[PDB]
Design a protein around this nucleic acid. Sequence first.
RNA 1: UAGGAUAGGGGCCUACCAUGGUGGUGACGGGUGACGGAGAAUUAGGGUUCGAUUCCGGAGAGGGAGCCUGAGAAACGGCUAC
RNA 2: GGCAUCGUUACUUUGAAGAAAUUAGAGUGCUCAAAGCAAGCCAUCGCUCUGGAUACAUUAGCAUGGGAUAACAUCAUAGGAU
Lengths: 86, 129, 152, 182, 149
Amino acid sequence: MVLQNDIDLLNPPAELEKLKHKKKRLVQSPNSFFMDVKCQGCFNITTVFSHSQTVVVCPGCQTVLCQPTGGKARLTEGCSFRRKGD
Amino acid sequence: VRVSVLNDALKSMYNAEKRGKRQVMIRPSSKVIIKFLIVMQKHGYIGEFEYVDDHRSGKIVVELNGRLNKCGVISPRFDVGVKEIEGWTARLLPSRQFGYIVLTTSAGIMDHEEARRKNVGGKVLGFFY
Amino acid sequence: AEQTEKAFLKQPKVFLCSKKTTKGNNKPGKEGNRFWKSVGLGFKTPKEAIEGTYIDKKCPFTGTVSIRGRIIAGTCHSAKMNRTIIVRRNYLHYVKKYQRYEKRHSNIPAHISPCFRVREGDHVIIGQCRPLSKTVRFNVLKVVPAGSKSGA
Amino acid sequence: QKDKGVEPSEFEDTVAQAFFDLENGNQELKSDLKDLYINTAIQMDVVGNRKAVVIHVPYRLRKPFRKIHVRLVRELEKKFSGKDVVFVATRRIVRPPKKGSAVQRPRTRTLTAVHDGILEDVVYPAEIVGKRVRYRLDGAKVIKIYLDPKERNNTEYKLETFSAVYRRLCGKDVVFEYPVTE
Amino acid sequence: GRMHSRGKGISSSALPYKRTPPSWVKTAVADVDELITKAAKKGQMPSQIGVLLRDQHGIPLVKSVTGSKILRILKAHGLAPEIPEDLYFLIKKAVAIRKHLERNRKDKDSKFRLILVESRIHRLARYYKRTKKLPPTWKYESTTASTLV
RNA sequence: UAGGAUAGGGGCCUACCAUGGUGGUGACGGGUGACGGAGAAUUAGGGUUCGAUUCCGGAGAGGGAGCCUGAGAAACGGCUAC
RNA sequence: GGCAUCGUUACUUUGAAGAAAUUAGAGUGCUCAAAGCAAGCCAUCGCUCUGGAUACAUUAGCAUGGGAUAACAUCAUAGGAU
Ligand SMILES: [K+]
Ligand SMILES: [K+]
Ligand SMILES: [Mg+2]
Ligand SMILES: [Mg+2]
Ligand SMILES: [Mg+2]
Ligand SMILES: [Mg+2]
Ligand SMILES: [Mg+2]
Ligand SMILES: [Mg+2]
Ligand SMILES: [Mg+2]
Ligand SMILES: [Mg+2]
Ligand SMILES: [Mg+2]
Ligand SMILES: [Mg+2]
Ligand SMILES: [Mg+2]
């Protein structure tokens, strides 16, 4: 790792930017995503933010899904998580 | 605060050049920075450089070829006529044989020899040699 | 009415008692008519000066004063007076040794006719005339209200 | 029809007949073809072979065509073959405001901000995810565009057609590419 | 760094490069507009309306789906608050500080923070006056400020 | 605003009215062994110091004031007073 | 020869007006020089129309072109343009 003389700033390695700060990447990108949380029962289509801040509910039993924390929302053990993307 | 992005660009480029780097990154980019780099490249003091669109202000990645000794801005942008260029040449340049002063004349951004050719004056952006 | 002093105010050389008709007689101010003139220099006489009832002998449009000399633009500084304002003319003085500019100003008293409504901070254009008082040597020729020139 | 005059070229007749014909043969595409058909149609051969056709939605019907651009060109596949049909939108380019001229010419639809406003129209099914500009040593700057990796269609062989179309529509050299990750 | 501190923190958000809304967003502009208007009716505010849209209703960014900012939408609908949100919250915080400091005359650390918050309030008010977002006769009166909030 | 006076504009002066005018972009006040300028000395460049004196402009005839004659003077190799 | 009615400046180019003397500077063998603006020549009842050039002269003011870099307010209740 002599210095950037060996790497190319234009085409940097695709995994080293998976670890840098989002602002400090070559092009700024969010670190979050949106996920459609599926409860144990029906009504499995609700969409929630990864770094959510509001305690979302469900139409059935209000089925508390996530708790807001300092980072990613604390999903419950009973709620299944899969992610939706662009 | 960032009061002159041209100074930051030129200073980062010069610092990278002294350390023997082959590429340098400039952030944020701007049109005047691009024109200064275009003049420097046309005279053969740098090489390739590419602008990267980050949708906010853009970055520049510049390829160095080791030919640039010094490059730096002049602040504040003093106004020089065609008759004063010689004087500034005696101040900012090593010798009359080479070196360049960049002027932002109303005909665009150019070097001082081109300004004398077109017989136009303007403000002084920086210098490089 | 416009007569608010202990003497009758009238436009000189304008006979106000002719029995013959008017409204069609050239050189307004003939056979009984408001007298008004164009100051020239590409300035438009306000409608409030042509169709007006005020009397002002120092007004450039309907008075005895002619505009000649220097034309100066500026901003209104203080307008707490009777048909007179102060115009602030900001400029830059070039300190030569340091090759740098320092901000300077200069107040100029001007006479503003009753056809011009003015406010503090308005942009005024004035023209030199003969002395009208101890300090007044300019007449207001145009007033542009502050925060204007809109439309696109 | 067309912006000015009354009599267009001799090329638009084929595309107008194709518009009047292709509706008969579809179920949903048949109904939603009451919009203003075209404004201009221009042919342009690309390097070697496989000439291309460029059409101009006026401005407002561009959004409905995004709902059919996936199928229409494919439906236009059964037409005058040797085609690369691409839809754009005609835009005003008003330069006017001079040193005075307090007219503002909104900074959204400026001059040459249309240039990047027609760029994604040529590649509508594949959204751009990156753009770079390289300034070569001869003053011959090129534009490299990273489209989304989700190609899954004929966007792969249209790159030279897009380059020629942009060269003849804006006078810029553009070379496209795809990300390595996915 | 911070205007009234020595901190240098850089934590913020990073908007995606893709300006177009994501494909999975199947909500029309009318629904988003009605939701925003209803929230503004319920005494919410643009910052805390955007988060409610982001979390419950799966709208990543209002400017993407509807093509315009929340404040512009509210102003076009005429439901915009008479006072900008940031100035309103600064005034609320200053009022709370004054209410606390009334009974604690020896708490000579909240007096300094009060000076700081009043300076911020005055700077923001001056800016909003320069852009005609507040009446030119507006003035921050400490005694009657609490009545505003 | 209206007059008076002047060769003539003007608070230049008078009657009446209004409360204005300048100032950290230094007003006001003080020092100058301060007449101003063209210019002088030394000057890589920038600059620093000087400028009573023969060319241009101003002011004075011991110190103040008033005035006649005259196209032109508040003249002093003109008058009147202290 | 037309014919309009216009964002304002700083900056930069070109022009004009710009006292002489001094300075820089062309010509000229006062015997040289500091100088001066003289003179020179066929060997004349004279001639070279002899010459008596040219720059610079901050800033402020007037006018022409340029619009890159900068400063002002102008920017979505349409009270907008045609
Ligand atoms: K007089
Ligand atoms: K005589
Ligand atoms: Mg009088
Ligand atoms: Mg009196
Ligand atoms: Mg003395
Ligand atoms: Mg002297
Ligand atoms: Mg003597
Ligand atoms: Mg003398
Ligand atoms: Mg005398
Ligand atoms: Mg004596
Ligand atoms: Mg005497
Ligand atoms: Mg004597
Ligand atoms: Mg004498």
